[PDB]
């Protein structure tokens, strides 16, 4: 009785579709500028959100301003379809105990590592303190990366196609709000054993200004 999530297979129409959503956002200059700032320093911002468990009161004032603009910009940015979104991650994504432990010399993932990954994460909620940068398709940015997550994001969910707002956004980037929880439904290896494939249902964000 599973739901159907669309996967984009046609880059040209993936951009048309994203552009088409974007043209309806009606974002302010300030919200566009905050998105641009996020794309320029995303690893730093998400790193601070993580270290501080989503509490932003201690961040520098200009950053607080940008984060609250970004959080509120999602009021304007929803997906009108059930869509699958992709990202690729490095071993530390699973925990620091996995950082230097996951792969083999051939470049296949370690079965015993992978087995540890599941007991820890399979069939469990995960809260993400940072924003979640994803792509509308499985773009080349990844493919090197040993972990691919496919998020199932339901109609009406907060999700912003930011690729046209910032030249430093990922190809077909779809940004998800920070402080989101998702449920990991499935973890399996790729066919050529180079990748752990994670399928998760996005449950949504705790940040709802309004
Ligand atoms: O230009 V703003 O109205 O986003 O301050
Ligand atoms: O010291 V500040 O939070 O105004 O950068």
One DSSP character per residue, 80-144 reads SS-EEEEEEE-GGGG-GGGTTTSB-TTS-B-HHHHHHHHHHHTT-EEEESS-EEEESS--TTSSS
d(CA 45, CA 65): 13
Cα dihedral sign for 57, 209, 34, 74?
Answer: positive
Q: Using alpha carbons, select from 197, 195, 189 the residue that is nearest to residue 107.
A: 195
What range does the domain containing 127 cover? Answer: 1-210
What length does the chain have?
Answer: 210
The helix-helix angle for 61-73 and 29-40 (nearest 10°) equals 110
Collapsed DSSP state (helix, strand, coil) of residue 167: coil
Q: Does the CB atom of residue 26 touch ligand 1 within 6 A?
A: no
Contact in structure between 200 and 150 (CB atoms under 8 Å): yes
How wide is the angle at C-alpha 78 spanned by C-alphas 54 and 174, nearest 5°? 70
Q: Any idea what the CATH number is for the domain that residue 187 is in?
A: 3.90.176.10
Give CA 149 to chain center in angstroms.
9
d(CA 123, CA 101): 22
How wide is the angle at C-alpha 135 spanned by C-alphas 209 and 160, nearest 5°? 25
Helix (H) or strand (E) holding 63: helix 61-73
Domain count, the chain: 1
d(CA 142, CA 191): 16
Which residue among 37, 133, 135, 157 is the active-site one? 133
Q: State the structure-solving technique.
A: X-ray
Ligand 1 centroid to residue 32 C-alpha, Å = 9
Cα separations in angstroms, 100 against 8, 103, 112, 128, 149: 34, 8, 13, 22, 20
d(CA 28, CA 35): 11
Ligand 1 centroid to residue 109 C-alpha, Å = 48
d(CA 205, CA 158): 8
Looking at ligand 1, which residue's alpha carbon is closest to its atom 1? 29
Looking at ligand 2, which residue's alpha carbon is closest to its atom 5? 60
d(CA 43, CA 202): 21
CB contact burial 11-46 (16+ within 10 A = b; e otherwise): eeebbebbeebbeebebeeebbebbbbbbeebeebb
Give CA 111 to chain center in angstroms.
25
d(CA 150, CA 205): 17
Token pair 């180079």 is found at 194
Q: Resolution in A for the shown PDB structure?
A: 1.9
Q: Is 173 a catalytic residue?
A: yes
Q: Which residues line ligand 2 (CB under 6 A)?
A: 60-61
Q: Using alpha carbons, select from 197, 206, 205, 53 the residue that is nearest to residue 122.
A: 197
d(CA 159, CA 79): 6
Using most ligand atoms within 8 A of CB, pick from 61, 64, 68 the residue to mutate for ligand 2.
61
Helix (H) or strand (E) holding 204: strand 196-205
């Amino acid at each position: 009785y599973s739901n159907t999530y669309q996967e984009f297979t046609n880059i040209d129409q993936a951009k048309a579709w994203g552009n088409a959503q974007y043209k309806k956002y009606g974002l302010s200059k300030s919200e566009k500028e905050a998105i641009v700032s996020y794309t320029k320093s995303a690893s730093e911002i998400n790193g601070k959100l993580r270290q501080n468990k989503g509490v932003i009161n201690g961040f520098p004032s200009n950053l607080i301003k940008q984060v609250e603009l970004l959080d509120k910009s999602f009021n304007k940015m929803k997906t009108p379809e059930n869509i699958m979104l992709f990202r690729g991650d490095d071993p530390a994504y699973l925990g620091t105990e996995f950082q230097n432990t996951l792969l083999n010399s051939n470049g296949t993932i370690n079965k015993t590592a992978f087995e540890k990954a599941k007991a820890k994460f399979l069939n469990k909620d995960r809260l993400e303190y940072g924003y979640i940068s994803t792509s509308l398709m499985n773009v080349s940015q990844f493919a090197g990366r040993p972990i691919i997550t496919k998020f199932k994001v339901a109609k009406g969910s907060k999700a912003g196609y930011i690729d046209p707002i910032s030249a430093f956004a990922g190809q077909l980037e779809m940004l998800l709000p920070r402080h989101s929880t998702y449920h990991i439904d499935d973890m399996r290896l790729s066919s050529d054993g180079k990748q752990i494939i994670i399928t998760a249902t996005m449950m949504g964000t705790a940040i709802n200004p309004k």
